[PDB]
Amino acid sequence: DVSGTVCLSALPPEATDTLNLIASDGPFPYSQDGVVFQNRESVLPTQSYGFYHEYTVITPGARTRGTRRIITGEATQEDYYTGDHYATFSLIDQTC
Numbered sequence: 795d796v797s798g799t800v801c802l803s804a805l806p807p808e809a810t811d812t813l814n815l816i817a818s819d820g821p822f823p824y825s826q827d828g829v830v831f832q833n834r835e836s837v838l839p840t841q842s843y844g845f846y847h848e849y850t851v852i853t854p855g856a857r858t859r860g861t862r863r864i865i866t867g868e869a870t871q872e873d874y875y876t877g878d879h880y881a882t883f884s885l886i887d888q889t890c
Contacts, residue, residue, distance in 0.1 A: 796838065796874065797882050801890035805875055808852045812864050813873065813888065816849060824850045824859055831865045837883060838874060841867065851875070 802810060815822055822828060831846040838846065845868050853860030861879040864886070866872065874883040 797884050799885040799887050800875060802886055802888045803890060805886065806851065806862065806877075808854075808862070809864060809875055809886070812849050812851045813886075816864070816866060816873075822849065823852065826850065826859065833865075835880075837880070838865065838867075844868075 802813070815827075820828065827849045828847055830844050831848040832843065833841070833846055847866045849864045849866070850859045851862035851864055853862055862875070862877050863880065865874045865876070865883065867874075871886075871888060873886040873888075875886050876883045
């Protein structure tokens with residue numbers, strides 16, 4: 795299930811960075827940025843394989859990708875933020 799919609803400005807600033815890189819088709823900081831997200835656990839709505847992709851939202855100080863991501867859907871501004879390593883997601887509203 796998607797846990798509601800969140801304004802971009804209420805997310806960590808790194809989420810804004812990640813969306814800016816998605817908008818320019820990268821390049822990206824991690825090799826895993828832009829791989830297909832399978833939605834294996836069906837947390838997000840069911841869509842075709844390849845409908846979703848994932849991108850790192852950098853955690854300051856982390857040596858690894860940490861727990862924060864944006865998952866894109868192929869729909870117009872369909873983007874989800876997770877801060878808890880894909881457990882929960884909120885739809886990102888870039889308008890606020």
